[PDB]
Write a protein that binds this DNA or RNA. Structure first.
Ligand SMILES: [Zn+2]
Ligand SMILES: [Zn+2]
Lengths: 196, 196
DNA sequence: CGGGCATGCC
DNA sequence: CGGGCATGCC
């Protein structure tokens, strides 16, 4: 069986979608999202809020899993890991790229067969008056980190799963972790218009 | 006592000097030396020949030690180490930046008090007809390596020591380990002329 | 903060 | 190979 997780969007019977809060497009804004590229630009070790939207209520015990995969075909089969420097320098294993902050029920998985890392939290329905649920993700390396992502773009795959392990929904977005998300967002959108 | 080793030139009673073989100044020549800057530009994990010249014959049992120190005052007291990436990826301990190739009597020292790394080989007199002795050094990180030198320039300190531990001579040269020694040499010499 | 150097890599 | 992008940092 494949050790490469699926990245194909599957909004599913609950109408599962992701949302992202708009930002101020300063050169070094901490986080900004491009709808045109379906791509988050963010800084390392700083909060990246991701909204979960659903049309129907998931059952009790639903979980939310995040997992990184390399976007380029030639790197898809390599597990995405923290670089040795940031690994060397209290729940998250130091090898995990993606953390969740602000949740008391976070679980970190090292898959015993595929060796892939993932981080899971319970799904919580949005509070009254609110239309979505926000998870605070953290990426612990830059996309450029030598010995880690090494300038290779990744996708974050967000899966909605029931307690039995059924896939309820899947979405993904590209990520560039970088020093200057505003500059790099502008550059990539201009490149899309001029050369895409 | 100081844990910062001396970098002051001490040619000494044997007339100890260093020599460097000229190169072709291609953009990515493997090694090239600037007399004006007293600075070697070289590529990582590739041979860097350094010549030992003396006016008088060192006694039997003389040793040749190499040690890296950061050139900038604000970094002088930090031990120069291999970065975590190149450490993770058969005599040299993986934490040592400087290796010697082509010698059967190499010793690697981790100083128990100063924590400084050094690599030592016996001094051999130049063969008949030859005016100097060549040691093949290897630098196992780029100057830019994140978590290691991190773009901070270093000096290599070469000391001539008798078997009793007396300092016979000391010389040093700055090093930039980089992908394109020819380009970076030209840039730094032009910067010296224009802004030095 | 935004302009521009940096430097392994394309 | 040398021109020029790359991107954390100055
Ligand atoms: Zn890293
Ligand atoms: Zn290194």
């Amino acid at each position: 069986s494949s050790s490469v997780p699926s990245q194909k969007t599957y909004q599913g019977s609950y109408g599962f979608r992701l949302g992202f809060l708009h930002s101020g497009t300063a050169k070094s804004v901490t986080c900004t999202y491009s709808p045109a590229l379906n791509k988050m630009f963010c800084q390392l070790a700083k909060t990246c809020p991701v909204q979960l939207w659903v049309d129907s209520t998931p059952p009790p015990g639903t979980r939310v899993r995040a997992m990184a995969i390399y976007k380029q075909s030639q790197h898809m089969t390599e597990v995405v890991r923290r670089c040795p420097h940031h690994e060397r320098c209290g729940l998250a294993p130091p090898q995990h790229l993606i953390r969740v902050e602000g949740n008391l029920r976070v679980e970190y998985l090292d898959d015993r067969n595929t060796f892939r890392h993932s981080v899971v939290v319970p799904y919580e329905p949005p509070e009254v008056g609110s239309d979505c649920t926000t998870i605070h993700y953290n990426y612990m390396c830059n996309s450029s980190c030598m010995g880690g992502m090494n300038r290779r773009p990744i996708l974050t795959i967000i899966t909605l799963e029931d307690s039995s392990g059924n896939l309820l929904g899947r979405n993904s977005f590209e990520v560039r972790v970088c020093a200057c998300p505003g500059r790099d967002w502008r550059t990539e959108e201009e490149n899309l218009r001029k050369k895409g």
